[PDB]
Write a protein that binds this ligand. Structure first.
Ligand SMILES: CC(C)=CCC/C(C)=C\CC/C(C)=C\CC/C(C)=C\CC/C(C)=C\CC/C(C)=C\CC/C(C)=C\CC/C(C)=C\COP(=O)(O)OP(=O)(O)O
Ligand SMILES: [Mg+2]
Length: 372
């Protein structure tokens, strides 16, 4: 995967190039490896040595820039998406006078040595091409035991206040923000939280989801409470409900009017995962798995190797047998007085994790993996 570091100044700055600078503001406490490589590239190509004025973060460096407290900053493209949360117009306030491309080695999928594996499902809250960066509002761990034919779905509330791995610097913030840093941040955040290996991920957005439901001929669920979605457009009665793509999207996004709010939304998402699974494991869909990949490969990202898809599909085609699916949710207390690493200047709702819930969730994950 690709990212870049840049030297940025204000849009109307008289500074045109890096040789005109003596110093640059940069968060060398937290992004030193990348920063030093940029400084080395600059020294190599422009024979210019810059001293660093340390900032506490990319956000802090940006604030110093617009306040006129520094002439120039280092910007890492990954963290521009974080700056954008507090400063939506940041791109229009700056120009870049130097740019360096970087590549990060992609962490391979982990192959289980046994019958059990974990897939992480990340749902991104935007329409459009799948490369669109947004928050991960769906965060569901699928623990799959092929021996016992059991699946446990563990949802972690998107507001869950947890140490965010990688770009999050292991500081506490709402889980959904990890999706802004990228799927690796999301994955490592949940591996660390639950003490498990996540073997694979699937990342999809609103547009990806609609396309998928369309291709599968809709999905069928049992709806447990009457509710409506999307400003009253869809009405969902109690009982068996068929959902086309638009109905299904409404069905997984509504929270405010549900008896248990965001917890019920998560449960609704789990219902839809089961329903999708029932369509994906029909004889017809399994046979046509190639067509499904071809039709959805542009909109759904995954590191499940092709060989692994082939194996799972063909094993299922030969064996049959449905998975018994159970669901759980990590619990906690909603608070508005705890600091966000990504957005230190905003009062955000976060969910402080309940320790005993965490222990139960981890124990349930291990049990399903070990066949208990
Ligand atoms: C059959 C095969 C392929 C294999 C064999 C299967 C086998 C042998 C075994 C079974 C296990 C395996 C291998 C696979 C199972 C299949 C998998 C991995 C997944 C199926 C499920 C899936 C891909 C998706 C379902 C995800 C889902 C419920 C929703 C996604 C919708 C999105 C993108 C976003 C919603 C965002 C929300 C809630 C609010 C934003 O809304 P907003 O932001 O406006 O609101 P606010 O923010 O304010 O709240
Ligand atoms: Mg959202």
């Amino acid at each position: 995967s690709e990212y870049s570091l840049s030297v940025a100044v204000l849009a109307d700055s008289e500074i045109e190039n890096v040789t005109q600078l003596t110093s640059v503001t940069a968060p060398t406490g937290t992004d030193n490896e990348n920063i030093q490589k940029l400084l080395a590239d600059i020294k190599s190509s422009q024979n210019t040595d810059l001293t660093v004025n340390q900032s506490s973060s990319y956000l802090a460096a940006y604030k110093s820039l617009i306040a006129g407290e520094t002439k120039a900053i280092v910007l890492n493209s990954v963290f521009e998406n974080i700056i954008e949360l507090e400063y939506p117009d940041y791109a229009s306030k700056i120009k870049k006078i130097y740019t360096k491309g970087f590549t990060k080695k992609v962490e391979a999928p982990k192959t289980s040595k046994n019958q059990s594996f974990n897939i992480y499902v990340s749902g991104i809250d935007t329409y459009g091409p799948i490369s669109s960066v947004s928050r991960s509002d769906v965060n569901i761990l699928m623990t799959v035991n092929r021996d016992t034919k059991k699946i446990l779905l563990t949802t972690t509330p998107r507001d869950a206040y947890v140490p965010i791995a990688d770009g999050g610097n292991n500081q506490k913030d709402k889980l959904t923000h990890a999706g802004i840093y990228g799927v690796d941040s999301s994955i490592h955040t949940l591996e660390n939280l639950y003490g498990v290996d996540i073997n694979y991920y699937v990342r999809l957005n609103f547009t990806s989801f609609l396309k998928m439901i369309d291709l599968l001929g809709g999905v069928d669920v049992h709806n447990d409470q009457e509710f409506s979605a999307l400003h009253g457009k869809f009405h969902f009665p109690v009982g068996n409900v068929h959902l086309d793509s638009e109905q299904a999207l409404g069905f997984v996004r509504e929270r405010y009017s549900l008896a248990d709010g965001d917890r019920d939304r998560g449960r609704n998402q789990q219902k839809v995962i089961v329903a999708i699974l029932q369509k994906l494991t029909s004889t017809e869909a399994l046979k046509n798995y190639s067509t499904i990949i071809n039709s959805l490969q542009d909109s759904i990202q995954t590191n499940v190797p092709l060989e692994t898809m082939i194996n799972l599909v063909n094993a299922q085609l030969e064996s049959g047998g449905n998975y018994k699916v159970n669901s759980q949710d990590l619990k906690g207390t909603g608070r508005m007085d705890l600091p966000s690493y990504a957005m230190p200047d905003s009062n955000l709702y976060v969910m402080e994790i309940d320790d005993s819930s965490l222990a139960v969730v981890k124990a349930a994950i291990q049990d399903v993996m070990e066949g208990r």
